[PDB]
Amino acid sequence: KQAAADRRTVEKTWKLMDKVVRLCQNPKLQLKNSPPYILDILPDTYQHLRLILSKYDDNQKLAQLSENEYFKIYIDSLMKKSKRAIRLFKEGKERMYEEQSQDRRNLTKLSLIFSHMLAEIKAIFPNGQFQGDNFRITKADAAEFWRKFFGDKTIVPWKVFRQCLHEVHQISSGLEAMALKSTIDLTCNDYISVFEFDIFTRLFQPWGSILRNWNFLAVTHPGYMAFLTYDEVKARLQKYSTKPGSYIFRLSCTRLGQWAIGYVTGDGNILQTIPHNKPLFQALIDGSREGFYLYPDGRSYNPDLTGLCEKVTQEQYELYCEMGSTFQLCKICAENDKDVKIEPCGHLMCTSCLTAWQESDGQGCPFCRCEIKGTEPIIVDPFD
Ligand SMILES: C[C@H]1CCCN(Cc2cc3c(c(C(F)(F)F)c2)CN(c2cccc([C@]4(c5nncn5C)C[C@@H](C)C4)c2)C3=O)C1
Ligand code: NA
Ligand SMILES: [Zn+2]
Ligand SMILES: [Zn+2]
């Protein structure tokens, strides 16, 4: 239940965003030349919110804008993530100037979220005018699923989304649904917009086997590198510059919904290819056959991807989730946040999962089997 997105509220986010920009202007961090460039994303976010206000330039237009379900979620999320970034500098202290630290890692995670939020608002409010109820989902079979379950909604809670997705593509576990959430919920706000749904369905098409494509291509494929800048792709492949056909595929925060395959050419150079509006597995199959994509991440074994033309372990889902921000999500249901701690073992879960466990098995903690001497409500930050 977020507050109305009135002018007063919108401006509170600008002041919080200016605070993040000031903290990030410190030369000790060296963030001026540090992607995704938070010192560029936050001013651009300001200019977009300003462009939107110019389009809703009267009291009646401001009343419609402040009631817009997507806009309220956006401003509330922008507010939350900005406060989170200020809190990161407050508690990180000198560990913010060390590039390998977890505090710096969390700032890169926040910088990626602000990048995704900016691309989202520009897609939903092109030219500052709301067009979410007329957003074009690139895949028709994915568009039909969205229209079927959510009508003309532009954004829906993750918990409603997951359940409706399960009705068409079965999700096998709590860890799989958590890995899935960190993949689709790019803005890390516990909601899925039609834009985030379009990116996910473009990346892992065809829709008919989208969870098999995602499990193979992203959860277990050695060639998958998640978000990388081109300099990082080159740095990764430089080790294998002596092995033509070495390759990796990555996401690009400036080309959402598309893949970029970086590869070692016969003459030692590192080049990249952006596949067309076709499945990534077909581009990898064609490239393997043609001698360009042979060794994923320089490794001799290239997985057989032909099965996708016509089994992931719980540990693999756990490693996959580490990169994202899902530590606050209940591992059992993957739909509610952790809000209770079991005493004395310290394991965490949501209130309703603990009540369900207590009425079903209840013979110790559902994770370690230790006797439940007590419970204590808690608030979990994604970076705890
Ligand atoms: C663009 C450049 C900027 C400098 C850091 N490098 C490396 C880097 C990549 C990711 C991250 C970091 C860091 F913040 F943890 F530090 C760092 C985080 N990160 C990230 C954050 C949330 C979700 C994901 C996805 C993912 N891929 N494998 C597992 N997961 C959960 C890709 C989404 C569709 C789901 C990835 C990177 O890609 C990326
Ligand atoms: Na989201
Ligand atoms: Zn739960
Ligand atoms: Zn326990």
Curated annotation (Swiss-Prot):
Phosphotyrosine: residues bearing it: 320
Post-translational modification: Phosphorylated on tyrosine and serine residues upon TCR or BCR activation, and upon various types of cell stimulation.
Binding-site residues, 4-O-phospho-L-tyrosine: 250
Modification Phosphoserine, positions: 246
Region ranges (SH2-like): 205-307
Region called Linker, residue ranges: 308-329
Subcellular location per the Swiss-Prot or TrEMBL entry: Cytoplasm
Residue segments, region EF-hand-like: 132-204
UniProt note on tissues of expression: Expressed in placenta, heart, lung, kidney, spleen, ovary and testis, as well as fetal brain and liver and hematopoietic cell lines, but not in adult brain, liver, pancreas, salivary gland, or skeletal muscle. Present in lymphocytes (at protein level).
Zinc finger (RING-type): 330-369
Disease per record: Autoimmune disease, multisystem, infantile-onset, 3: An autosomal recessive disorder characterized by autoimmune manifestations apparent in the first months or years of life. Clinical features may include hypothyroidism, type 1 diabetes mellitus, systemic inflammatory manifestations such as fever and hepatomegaly, and autoimmune cytopenias.
Protein name: E3 ubiquitin-protein ligase CBL-B
Portion of the full-length sequence here: 37 to 427 of 982
